[PDB]
């Protein structure tokens, strides 16, 4: 119960090793970064996050 | 116009076969009217979300109103130019209303161009709306010869290339395929590792364009 639903969306081009564009589904799109433990190479433009 | 006392024409419809110069005339007009030139793809309109048909016609006929002497070249109006879709039809209803802008649009000249006139409904063709219609016919022998000389002014030429024979050889060419046979004569000068194009190159360009 002490948890929150993470938003589901889809990534676009990287900008840095810590900057990535994501479309947040039918909502808007943002630029965000890796939390700590996500493999950057395992991210590709369009991978679901 | 005052010395004839008549009202100025409201707009122009360029219709006819595809690939005959209406685009080229629009581009050339953009080069010389020296009034503010604005252009709209017919499919840019209506689009997505409500009002994108309302906004893109209304505010368009507000920026045009601001710019006063201006040419709007609508292109391929048929995309929405058909008969009848709701918002789809709403875009034309607003377009009709905006071209029903009374005066101060005497400095607003609309040229919408579209092949295959048939679909275009009578709504915009009525005298309270675009009065003028212009067909662009396929060029004749002299006009084909001249468009040959136009598209071939950049060529590297062998002696005695009788363009008259090729112009005679190519009936019904609507102009775009004249540019096609020019490019194609360039093709069949090229792969023979040549730059001097020959008469039979234009001949077989006529052959393969058909």
């Amino acid at each position: 119960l002490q948890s929150v639903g993470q938003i589901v969306g889809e990534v676009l081009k990287q900008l840095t090793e810590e900057k990535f564009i994501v479309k947040a589904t039918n909502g808007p799109r943002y630029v965000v970064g890796c939390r700590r433990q996500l493999d950057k190479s395992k991210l590709k433009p369009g991978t679901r996050v | 116009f005052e010395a004839l006392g008549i009202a100025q024409p409201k707009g122009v419809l360029l219709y006819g076969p595809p690939g005959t110069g209406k685009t080229l005339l629009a581009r050339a007009v953009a080069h010389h009217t020296d009034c503010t030139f604005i252009r709209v793809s017919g499919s840019e309109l209506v689009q997505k979300f409500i009002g994108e048909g309302a906004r893109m016609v209304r505010e368009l006929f507000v920026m045009a109103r601001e710019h006063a002497p201006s040419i709007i070249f609508m292109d391929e109006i048929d995309s929405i130019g058909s008969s009848r879709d709701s918002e789809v039809q709403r875009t034309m209803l607003e377009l009709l209303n905006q071209l029903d802008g009374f005066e101060a649009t005497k400095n607003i000249k609309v040229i919408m161009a579209t092949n295959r006139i048939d679909i275009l409904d009578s709504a915009l063709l009525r005298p309270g709306r675009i009065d003028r219609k212009i067909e662009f016919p396929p060029p004749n022998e002299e006009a084909r010869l001249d468009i040959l000389k136009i598209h071939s002014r950049k060529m590297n030429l062998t002696r005695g290339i009788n363009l008259r024979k090729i112009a005679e050889l190519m009936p019904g060419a609507s102009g775009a395929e004249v540019k096609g046979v020019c490019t194609e004569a360039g093709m069949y000068a090229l792969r023979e590792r040549r730059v001097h194009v020959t008469q039979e190159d234009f001949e077989m360009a006529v052959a393969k364009v058909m």
Binding site: - | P17, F73, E76, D78, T183, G186
Partner: protein, 203 residues
């Protein structure tokens, strides 16, 4: 902040090569002059000066060996390449059809000299007709957006369009006409010395 231009292809690079084709020497030579040369020999074109072709269409009996050539040029090309089939251009939500078309083409422009590949264009390029229903309106809008970005007002940067079609007795001539389809080609069924080449290559 300001984002980079736009917001496409990848390292897929299909296996097939020009060494792998059956031997359609006329067709391979023609299409490669259409696409590959204006990348390299555009330097030679500038001396010849003939406005390199930017649009080629491919007639053929069903799978006559043309999408083979499509994947071959896609893999072998040095320039950027985009592969979006014509039938892929659709939507529920009315109106975005034309924009996504224009997004693909603008993306192509910003991607530097590139070749847009569209297969089965006959699905969304049938000869225009009385659009008495919304679907007809939208598909005709798709066609007209493709037309007007291909020539309608803006001469593009030196991009190219490669297209695949099976029937092509359809395909409204506004698409067919040369200024946007400079060097259309028909792939007929293989015959004397063509079948021999293709047997030899496969065998």
């Amino acid at each position: 902040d300001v984002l980079p231009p736009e917001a496409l292809t990848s390292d897929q690079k299909p296996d097939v090569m020009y060494a792998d084709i059956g031997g359609m020497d006329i067709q391979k030579q023609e299409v490669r002059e259409a696409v590959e040369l204006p990348l390299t020999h555009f330097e030679l074109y500038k001396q010849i000066g003939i406005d390199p072709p930017r649009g080629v269409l491919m007639y053929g009996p069903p799978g006559c060996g043309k999408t083979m050539l499509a994947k071959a040029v896609a893999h072998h090309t040095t320039a950027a390449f985009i592969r979006v089939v014509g039938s892929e251009f659709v939507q529920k939500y009315l109106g975005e059809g034309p924009r996504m078309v224009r997004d693909v083409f603008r993306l192509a422009k910003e991607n530097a000299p590139a070749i847009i590949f569209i297969d089965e264009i006959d699905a969304i390029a049938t000869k225009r007709f009385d659009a008495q229903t919304g679907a007809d309106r939208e598909v005709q809008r798709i066609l007209l957006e493709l037309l007007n970005q291909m020539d309608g007002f803006d001469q593009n940067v030196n991009v190219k369009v490669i297209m695949a079609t099976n029937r092509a007795d359809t395909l409204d001539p506004a698409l067919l006409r040369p200024g946007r389809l400079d060097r259309k080609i028909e792939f007929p069924l293989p015959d004397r010395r063509q079948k021999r080449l293709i047997f030899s290559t496969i065998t």
